[PDB]
Design a protein around this ligand. Sequence first.
Ligand SMILES: [Cl-]
Ligand SMILES: [Zn+2]
Ligand SMILES: [Zn+2]
Ligand SMILES: [Zn+2]
Length: 129
Amino acid sequence: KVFGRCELAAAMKRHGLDNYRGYSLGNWVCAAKFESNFNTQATNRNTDGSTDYGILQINSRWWCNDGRTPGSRNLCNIPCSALLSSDITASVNCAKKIVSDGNGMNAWVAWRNRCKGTDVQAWIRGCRL
Ligand SMILES: [Cl-]
Ligand SMILES: [Zn+2]
Ligand SMILES: [Zn+2]
Ligand SMILES: [Zn+2]
């Protein structure tokens, strides 16, 4: 499923991401835009052999199991395929664990390089949340 900008903002708010760990909704929408362009089915292979899954491109190296990432962990205790659902519950729940890992949203390289320090409020502007 490819979410509309405001539709995803609303879904993320309902799932508890608004200001989670201090990150306003705009940060999460911005991250999702550049990681997956709001497409829940996005998958991308990483240089280390792991793979990124879903709207927030969560990696198999540490967070989910895809059965093909040697030496990896499954800290969110979920099959990576669960992160591709039209229902973002799995991705959000795992994102909450990732953002709490210590480095905040810097865990998402795209957020650091394309959202951090910018006007992220623009991503939820006009949305009736
Ligand atoms: Cl980047
Ligand atoms: Zn829209
Ligand atoms: Zn939902
Ligand atoms: Zn990635």
